[model samples]
Structures are given as C-alpha cells and as structure tokens.
Target: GPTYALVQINQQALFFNLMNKGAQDAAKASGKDLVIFNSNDNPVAQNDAIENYIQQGVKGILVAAIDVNGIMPAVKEAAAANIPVIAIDAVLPAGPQAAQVGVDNIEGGRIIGQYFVDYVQKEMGGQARLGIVGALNSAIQNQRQKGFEETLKSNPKITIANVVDGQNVQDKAMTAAENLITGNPDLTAIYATGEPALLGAIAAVENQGRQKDIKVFGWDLTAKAISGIDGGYVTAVLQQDPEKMGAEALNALNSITSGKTVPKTILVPATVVTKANVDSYRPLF
Candidate 1:
C-alpha cells in the first residue's frame, strides 16, 4: 500500500477540476491513498505543498504546474527523496519528471490562429485589428502566444493593436482587458491565452457593450464563453482533454513505480471549438 500526493495548480478552475477528477479515479483504481493539495497559483505555496508531501513520504507526486521553472527545484527535491514526479499541462525539465502529460500547445495555438485567419478573411474583408490578453507567468501560455504570433506573421492585413498581461487572475485579467479595449477602441479580435484571460475578455467586452465589435479566439471553455459563442462574440476556442492528461499522468506514475517502462511524453490533442461545433461539447468541471 502506498500514498500519493497531487499538487494541483488550482481546483477552483473548471478545467483543473476535470483534471483532478481523472487523477482521483485512477488513484482509487490503483488502490493507493491520494491526497490533493491546491496551490491557488502561488509558486511559494506550490513548493511548500511539495515539501509537505516529501515529508509525508509519498510514493508519487503529480503536478499541474503554475510557474513551470519555479516548481522544478521542489520537484527535484522530491526526486532526491525517491518520489516519482509526473507533470501535467506543463513539462518539467530533464531530471525532475519521470513522465509528462500534456497537449502540444504550440500546435493548438497554430490551429486557433489559422481559424482566425479564415474568419478574418471571410467576415472582416481580410482585415482585423487584434488585441492579446495573456497570462505572462505561465510557460505553456507563452508557447501558445508564440505559436499564434508565428502564424499571424504571414497575415499582413491583421495588425495587433495591443497586448496586456492578465496575470492569470480573473479580476486582474478583467482590468488588463479593459485597458486593451480603451487603448484600442477599434479592436476587432482578441486572443486570450488562457482560461482566466478568456473569461475576463468575455466580461470586459460585454460590460463595455463591445460584444458586437470584438470577437475572441482563445483557449479553454467556460459557460460564459459558450454563451459568447451563441451570441456570436466568440469565434473559436482551443479546448484540451484535461481529464485525459490526469488519467495518463496517474497511469505513467503507476507504471514507473511498478518497475515498468513509461513513455517520456504523452501528448493529448486539443479540439478547436467554434459556434458550429459548440453544442457537441459537454461541459466538464
């Protein structure tokens, strides 16, 4: 019998709740005691949670990293204590992780960007004034932003009007998005790099009565995002299979602890959600 600990970035998020559920189900089936600690997106708190688990002598730790590089030292510390670390959403660097589970965010961003191109070309006469709302701290979000910018490179007709950091908090994101709206009054599209950024953009647009002007292309899904799609303010969203990431993380951990070989990386694909296909998705949280 063994105990495991999962350091969740934040279970308060609908996306992370799906991830936690899948991890919990797998841990139960594995006949291991699993305890989950939520960091609330605090790097210091995340390290402290990992240290507590190390002290508790857990056999394995699964993490949905908030600050990718910042969490690695504690992950390495867990490794020194012989605990296998499986990372989800954000890949830990070389030595700290036994296996990593996540989607290829760069490719997902490219997909959404391509959709933006087609939408702008068709509906906006090959022209769009773009704004970006991003979580500046997350490595994964940075990758997504990079891929998006790379795609937009080929489209000269689309100009990025403004970029703002949402800091990955809803209220902060709302304020950042408000700044974008005010700074770029003609903003035609918004690219939100994460869940909080997307939600905040949706709120800011609606609050300012700019819903008719600025459609959004972003990552993750929420009830409000769905409503935005229905009302025609959201153009597209790249949604990941978070539950699959969680289950695969636990599966990899089980394999490693049982002396079996596991794949170095497990990549789940993201689905591009649009108004045409929005109804097909069941809300997960």
Candidate 2:
C-alpha cells in the first residue's frame, strides 16, 4: 500500500559515497523496490520531489532534511498515509521519523576529546591549551561538543579556553581560527566538529604561521581531510563510515519491510583517522 524511497540531499558531498552503495545493497538484499533521489539542499525542490513521488504511488520516505524545521509538512503527510520515515545522518528537530541511522556525534566528539588528552600528553609532554571549532546551528555539532566536554570532566591537563562555530565553511573556519590564535596565543590544539571547518582551521593556523605549534582534530573526513592526515595538517579525525551508516540504514529499511522491527537508532563505530592508518581506509572507502 506504500511506496518507499531514500532521498539524499547534497549528493556531491563525499559522505554520500557510502550511502549510495549501502542503499544499493540493501535494496538488492531486501528484494523490495528502492531508489535514492537527490537534492541540492533546496527546501522547495525537496518538497516538490517528495510530493511527486507520493503521486507516483510511493509510501514510505527516508530523507535527510535540508532544514531540520523546514520539512515537517512532508513528513507529516506521509505519516498520515501510514508511510513511516527514516532519518539518515541528520535528525529532524521536533518532527517525525520512524528511525534514525546516524553516528553518535557526542560519542565521536568524546573520542576526539580523549584523543586530545593523549595527543597533548604524547606530543606536548602532557600539557596544552586547546581551541574548539563548533558548528553553530547544526544539531550534530552540539552533540559533538557535549561529548568532548564530557571527556574533560575527568581529565585536567587539557584546557579548552575558546570555542567558535565554523559553520562547516572555509572562510568562517578561518575567521574562527584567527580568533583562536589572537586570543589564545599559546593555544596548542584545535578540535573542530565538521570536516570543512577542521580543514579550514588547519589552513587558518598555517596562514597565521601557527601550524607547527597547533594540533588539529575534528569530525567527518572528506577527501581533503583524508589528505590532511598525510600532509601533517590534521593531527587526527573522528571519522564516520558514511557508507556503513547508509548500508545499515537501508538494511534497517529492508528489515522493516520484511515485518521485522529495526532498532530506532543504530551507531556504527567511530575511529580516529591518523596518518599511520590512513591508507588502511582504502578498502572501506
């Protein structure tokens, strides 16, 4: 009685590489018809696409909302039609989603936070001041911060003085990095929540001639972030398996159609992406 589709926003982002394959595998394994639709993060286009699918006999909908608050009506309409929605990577704020397939950003951040302790102790001989690059409006960013700060509750050597939102963009990350350098002249490291922000911060520190003095860490790994590990720009990355998450989410959808209950949430492992093991990801990627 319902049709299902996986709607992805911003297909060009490297993370989608995983989601695409995972969705394919899940579709094949489930023997149910599935398709991945793309959007450019435009709210109007996203709404129109979903409506068109509904008209075409689609029932269930899975999408990463462009704006957490902007896609409520579509989700609600689908729910009214008894078609559940699955959220991938990003969750809708105050809206409905039958399930969420995403990384535990807070935990990912905490891993980085602990890595900060280890890095400072090993590289700085156990003492360092750090700056954090946060993503302002994104829910995932805040979750990462929460996890990083939680790790600090027990460890006392690392001091995080300033936190700034990079908005996951290069220019803003640069601005945030300048502020970190200007305010904390002795800042020894940076923890950014997004890939673009982390790379941008690395660039900022380099531009300010502080690259040698500051270590960088953050979440997500684009090709640039992967390259940063090899180039010595990033100290480490708390990276997610975008493909793994997508595969599992699609796997969950398959289970749902098979009359099995999938977990409300799934957490894949997070790893500290470092230069030594960067080459190992070739297989997973």
What value of lDDT does candidate 1 attain over all alpha carbons?
0.87
What lDDT score goes with residue 57 in model 2?
A: 68
Which 10-residue window of candidate 1 scores lowest in summed lDDT? 276-285
lDDT of 2 at 84: 68
Candidate 2 lDDT, 77-193, residue by residue in tens: 776766667887776765556788777877888887887777777778888787888888887788888898888766587787798888878798889888888888878888888
Cα misplacement distance, residue 173 of candidate 2 (Å): 2.5
Highest lDDT among the candidates is held by which one?
1
Whole-model lDDT values for every prediction: 0.87, 0.77
Mind sharing the TM-score for model 2? 0.85
For residues 1-285, what per-residue lDDT tens digits would candidate 1 score against the true structure? 338888998867777888998888998988877888888878899999999889988889999888888898999999899899988987676775888898998888898998888888889989999999988898888989988988887779999898899999889999989889988877899999999999999989988898888888899888788888999998899999898888888878888889999988899888889988898874452
